[PDB]
Symmetry: D2
Subunit: 461 residues, 4 copies
């Protein structure tokens, strides 16, 4: 008589279990942690509030935390990212999950609240696993008493880490965090190669458009922008890249991209006259990758080529000015997470109007909204880091330290390089890769241990 | 009556000047520093011992240092890297240079000694520019009194920085250094994209071999290994990558390379039995990128496919066991910097023997030995960093500080991110790239200044 | 629906029609050659009186083809040429427009044959068909074997695909072909567009939808390096797969080598003597993904399937399901459906499986065309070329009126032909303009210098592109 | 006492022999023909006038024809294409060769004349091997008596075949020809993949310019244009493609190139107004691939970005209007086969002028002029076809046929597909490729013989 969940359709559970059993075979670092630590139960007593895309891959993470002794209460960090069969499989395993694909904003907030509360009272939570910081922010604003008993936060993504670092700077962060994002086996795996796999995937599922020989503008050339640019270029798109960071821009040039600004001489003065109308008039696809606000603004949307596709693979819905499009233009649903945005006006539209844009996932994460996000073998690295970060912070028991000792441990930190390397090795073995062992003379020659770490913490890979 | 130089052929000077004038047009960051600092003469009174590849690109660096007020005495850091027309053009400008292509080891040492000594006595040197640490080591071992008057070292390359850091750890480093290598506009420009341009270049000039559809083994997947692997794969080579670092190996896998070891299960126990003879029997091209010793060892060389090409783009000549090949096998010169190594024995060889390897540049830096190394537009970034580093250390005047103040400034440092970004922006403008400017709201949203820096010092790009 | 009381169709779900119409309106904007033909020929109605039996994948793209034929004056009766290729929203939109269509995703073999029969028969009697549009030759074969009298009134066949063309040429050689045909496949704007670039787009698409597997850094074996093999190999290599290519044609193998692929055989020294000992078990033990592209039989045979790495994906993008020995797998191994068109094939035996068994293969679309079975096949802008050629071929054969010729005149016109290069060039130009491409015009001096007309054709018929 | 040759320097012979011995190991189809036909001497009595680039690769062809019993007299078909060490090695083998790198037009004609005449009288020639048709045209215009006794022409290249077909159409062709170009193992090997290898090679040797991130315009998208486009794109160039053939243009689009015209709406009026000044103002590199005339015209050259590189990889130097540049602009030699073309005027230039173009190989074949042309393993296919074509026409003995029988055999033909496949198989084995054999059932199923041919003559590959 387990009822402590809310999912689209519990009857999808058997399908979800079939997909979990396949995904496990794609996730050797995660399954290795299960086999290694199952006996020791290092998360026994851990009670984890989890807020991350309720996908099959997240399912393998959840069941790894549970297999290591954790109890969890789970929600999605995005209204469109859930795989309903994954959510069903987790609910049917007796794990509290509050997630479905196509939540309203009200339902999204209700789902997070259902993780925080059990039977109408704060759950005895002592750990947080977050993606983007929404759960972190709700706990700090609304449930500070709960944070007193929480040993730490493990934060998945660039945007969430930024929000943690703001809180640390302002003296408002109440518990230590591990920045899972900045593991090399996360940032330079998931952020880059995940988006390389999943961006063209989502655009194909959403539009089935030929990409080869068409014009893309990728806004950003960080990890996600690099992966996104490659996703499109490898399909034969002609990709132009926009950046504010000259080092990232230099990388775009050397990687064989033309670096352009949507604005004349790169100056965004907020006027239509500032828009390079000739450039935007030629673009078939714009992708936002920034973690920033209004990088595809109203004036850019007005200037875009007719029938251009617009999408966002970085954070929230405000990289693209969707608020402007809701206020001014008529939305025609093609199918779920695909809208034609008719630039002819707000009230009606002509079914045969040629002056529209195609918006994917209403400007939310396109890879998860219009496809299934990163593949298992990539998320294996991110999620092995999550499990190790949960173990580290849980075992440190911050909430049980004296005030003086808390002051010294209240930080946002990355996992040590040795763990990053061990996750990498399990990932390499999953490809059938064979890593060479240094000889003693070779290890002495370059000044490292035969078992590593092989690089100083300053190394950028 | 200028005679304070030694070059192959002074009559090549006019040709060298023609090539310097073209190279200047490819090096906007360097020529920007000339225009910026020429008036102020920030290196007036600087007396720079330089030891770096006497190429056309090094020529533009030398003339930038001189245009900012430096005097220099110059040698090459490699016996095969000099462009004789570049050396001639620098000598013809009245700058002391001791460099030619195809030096002996004795001539190499003599050339460095001719920079250190002027008219049989130590030069009144006060700055060092080094590539690989040979000049740095000679000053510390043989001329320690000269280091009393030296304000600093600016070190070009990964291997040289390793040697500096050993000296710092052991308390044997006598003057502060700038690690130029670990600027992003050096390491993730020069080390990677330089080798992408110049490795297939050198292999074509040396062998004219088709690379498409043939089998390569790249030992190492650091910045040089990454660029080297792309150099070959973009030509259609089937590239396998060897690594000791599982994170680098993980990147090789994600980049679409098979990761293999020369040794069964990656264990080099020193025996022939440990060699994967089946793997090495299929390899047409082996490239070493490691900075390590004996990564292409005698047993690997014995097991390699007949008529395989062997080359090193890392350091020294000891990445490949060339000593074993000189001791055991007969060398037939095809043309300069190309030898057939006859595995039939040491004494004679049959002109028609089928059992040989092709060694490029006698196992020394293949890009500079068999071609012209990195292109001007790439070296522009490295050398803009060198000039800014020379300015910083010269203006700090370490050698004139009291003992107490020296103790605090005796360090190996990178340039600030802000300077790295300024070099990057000049490089981007040379591609016709346009960097977007953040709005105040956007800069506040992601927590950076509109002027940058745009990333924390932890950012890996 | 549209027509009062219309019931002359069978589709999965008529309520998908509005959705299908939304997708047709988008696809039209991606298909300028096809929409150009509509605008050009609408007034002239060159297919007025044409009654076309069509058998091709009932996709959104096929929907734009059908409505082009109807806009030019044709009546049609339509079925899919594959049990898994139909997009049910496309089928619904076509039925709702009052066009007879018999197609759904996930037909049985019985349902497949019934659907073709429903195009051929109207109210239980042969339709007064006078044209055939076919993809793979099944409808062509049924008319020749079962309804020869209907071919007396048929002016021509226009055939989409390599396999169908092969079957037409066998019929011509054997003197059994009863009406002339246009080989649409061998337009350059078909073969070297659709067969290659279509598969480049749609193969990795179908593998992602079907498995969501990371391809980067994993090992693929592509069997074949014709147009489909070339496009398939690029689909995987551009994702970072380590692709090995098998071929029987040394010229295609040479192209694979030059394109940067290792050319290997499943069999030692390339000799398939039918023994297990002939299988290169070491090579197949390393393969994560096998793709068949040949149009040939048993190119991924039982012994190869036995030797494949555990949890390898197996799929076919060649026109029929016998490229892989699926019959051997149905006979010997237990099939576990993951989801539609995805099965785990448990090599532990026939009767039952352990849910947690590690010794299985993943088969996509039960060995049938994987791009159409697990995704949506080629994109609109590619199918535009193929389908512009189909419309031109239909116009040509319908206007020639073969069925109304005297016996002596028929003998001379009974052939399998391609469209003239000038039409191939005109399709290509409309495709280029859809990319915003600008084709240069030769000067008179330049046209004289290379010996062509300023208007083309620009190449002799021998040119291979 | 062998003196029947003219080369740059006979002392280069030993070096040329070293390179021939290596090149043989890269050319298994050619070396296979030697082993197969040695004993049978199928070219015994053949006396071949050869006119093709006197490269190392051509050396292996010559020595194959000689090993099969031919005598030859050889010249280059290009003033810049000879490798002087190859010419020396062939002369030192007692083979008449008249070729050096850097011929004048007068020297070029004299060299062809020295093949045609022996001791001041027509040689007893009975076979012609040609590349571009210059020798073929001289024989038809000036030596028709010699053509009476010639059994055939084997023609290497697209331009030469066009010239043969015009002669056949006009009834002026006097002997049958094999179109060696349209073997698949020639056209879709040499013309495409050869240029992919050798175009970026020649641009690097000639300029050492970084190509990554820079803008290229490739005029033409035939076999050479396809390979040239890839040569640049694989290096990271942003490649735009021009074409007059909409099918080739369609292929460029699908291959992921933007298709542009130098002229507004593609219409060349002959006026400056017709030039797209904005487009040409952004181009760093223009490459002509057409076999057509004035496809990089005077107005395009005037509009090109300052310091753009201009080159031609089509068979003759009239693709670029070099005549306009000789008439109007000052040429500064950088080094052999590299000129700065100063757009400031005809009589003198400022050494520091910024307004110049860089022209490679004075507008002649850039791959052979500035590098070594196609690699051995590619030329192996072309030259295996040449040998089989020489055998076929020599054995047919056209010159000895009655007039009635000649009339029936006077044609321009390709080799049978079966021979194309046999060359391909030897090329594949040189990669270590393993071709599968059809079963009898499989062969019957697709309607071919187990031993081929595998495709109908209509197949395009
Ligand atoms: N969809 C996914 O699966 C996925 C994967 C990982 C991360 N993310 C999200 O993607 C976003 C980016 O993450 P990242 O790791 O690449 O961060 P990053 O800091 O590496 O890169 C972001 C880049 O955006 C650039 N940028 C900022 N404002 C810009 C503007 N106005 N114009 C142009 N460029 C601008 C910055 O200079 C920076 O290089 C974040 O929101 C992150 O959480 C999503
Ligand atoms: N030739 C040039 O123009 C050029 C350019 C820059 C740097 N370099 C030189 O290249 C070398 C590498 O530079 P880098 O910046 O790539 O350094 P790096 O540390 O980034 O990369 C070296 C890599 O070698 C790997 N490695 C070490 N021992 C190995 C072994 N036994 N087998 C396999 N892999 C092994 C390490 O794990 C590391 O990832 C240095 O010697 C550097 O000075 C040369
Ligand atoms: N799925 C799609 O959307 C799509 C696209 C177009 C064509 N097709 C089908 O794809 C198939 C191939 O079409 P194509 O145009 O590429 O034909 P093709 O003749 O160009 O290529 C087929 C290749 O298979 C090779 N081959 C034959 N037997 C082989 C064997 N035993 N092992 C290895 N290679 C072998 C041949 O040598 C040939 O090169 C046909 O069935 C065609 O109808 C499907
Ligand atoms: N340098 C070498 O090693 C090498 C190799 C092989 C062939 N070639 C020569 O290269 C040339 C091309 O050979 P190919 O086999 O590619 O010929 P091709 O006919 O295959 O290609 C030439 C292309 O140029 C296009 N073209 C013609 N005029 C044009 C114009 N004004 N603007 C744009 N495009 C135009 C044509 O449409 C055609 O597609 C010939 O001269 C051939 O002999 C040189
Ligand atoms: N398939 C997936 N399952 C779960 N999380 C994912 C998936 N794909 C991407 N993500 C995560 O989404 C985050 C952005 O919210 C990224 O940091 C990435 O780690």
């Amino acid at each position: 008589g387990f009822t402590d969940y809310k999912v689209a359709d519990i009857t999808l559970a058997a399908w979800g279990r079939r997909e979990l059993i396949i995904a496990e075979s794609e996730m050797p670092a995660l399954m290795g942690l299960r086999r290694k630590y199952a006996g020791q139960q290092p998360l026994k007593g851990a009670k984890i509030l989890g807020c991350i895309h309720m996908t099959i891959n997240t399912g393998v993470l959840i069941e790894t935390l549970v297999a290591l002794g954790a109890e969890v209460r789970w929600s999605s960090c995005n209204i469109f990212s859930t795989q309903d069969q994954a959510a069903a499989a987790i609910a049917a395993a007796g794990i509290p999950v509050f997630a479905w694909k196509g939540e309203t904003e009200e339902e999204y907030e209700w789902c997070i609240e259902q993780t925080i509360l059990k039977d109408g009272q704060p759950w005895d939570a002592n750990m947080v696993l977050d993606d983007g910081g929404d759960l972190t922010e709700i706990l700090h604003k609304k449930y500070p008493q709960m944070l007193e008993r929480i040993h730490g936060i493990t934060e998945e993504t660039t945007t969430g880490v930024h929000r943690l670092l703001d809180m640390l700077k302002n003296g408002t962060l109440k518990v230590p965090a591990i920045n899972v994002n900045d593991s090399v086996t996360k940032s330079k795996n998931d952020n880059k190669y995940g988006c390389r796999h999943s961006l063209n995937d989502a655009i194909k599922r959403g539009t089935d458009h030929l990409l080869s020989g068409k014009q893309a503008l990728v806004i950003g050339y960080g990890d996600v922008g690099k992966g996104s640019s490659q996703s499109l270029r490898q399909e034969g798109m002609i990709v132009k890249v926009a950046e504010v960071d000259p080092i990232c821009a230099m990388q775009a040039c050397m990687d064989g991209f033309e670096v352009v600004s949507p604005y004349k001489n790169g100056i965004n003065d907020g006027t239509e006259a500032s828009i390079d109308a000739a450039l935007l008039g030629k673009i078939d696809l714009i992708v936002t990758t920034t973690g920033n606000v209004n990088v595809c603004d109203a004036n850019m949307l007005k200037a875009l080529k007719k029938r251009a596709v617009v999408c966002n693979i970085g954070h929230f819905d405000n990289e693209i000015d969707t608020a402007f499009m809701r206020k001014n233009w008529a939305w025609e649903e093609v199918k779920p997470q695909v809208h034609k945005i008719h630039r002819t006006g707000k009230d009606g539209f002509d079914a045969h109007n040629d002056d529209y844009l195609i918006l994917l996932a209403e400007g939310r994460l396109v890879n998860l909204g219009n496809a299934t996000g990163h593949p298992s073998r990539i998320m294996d690295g991110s999620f092995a880091n999550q499990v190790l970060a949960q173990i580290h912070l849980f075992e440190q028991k911050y909430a049980d330290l004296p005030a003086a000792e808390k002051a010294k441990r209240l930080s946002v930190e990355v996992l040590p390089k040795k763990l990053d390397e061990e996750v990498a090795l399990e990932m390499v073995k999953g490809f059938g890769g064979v890593v060479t062992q240094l000889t003693p003379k070779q290890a002495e020659y370059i000044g490292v241990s035969v078992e590593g770490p092989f690089k100083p913490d300053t190394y950028r890979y």
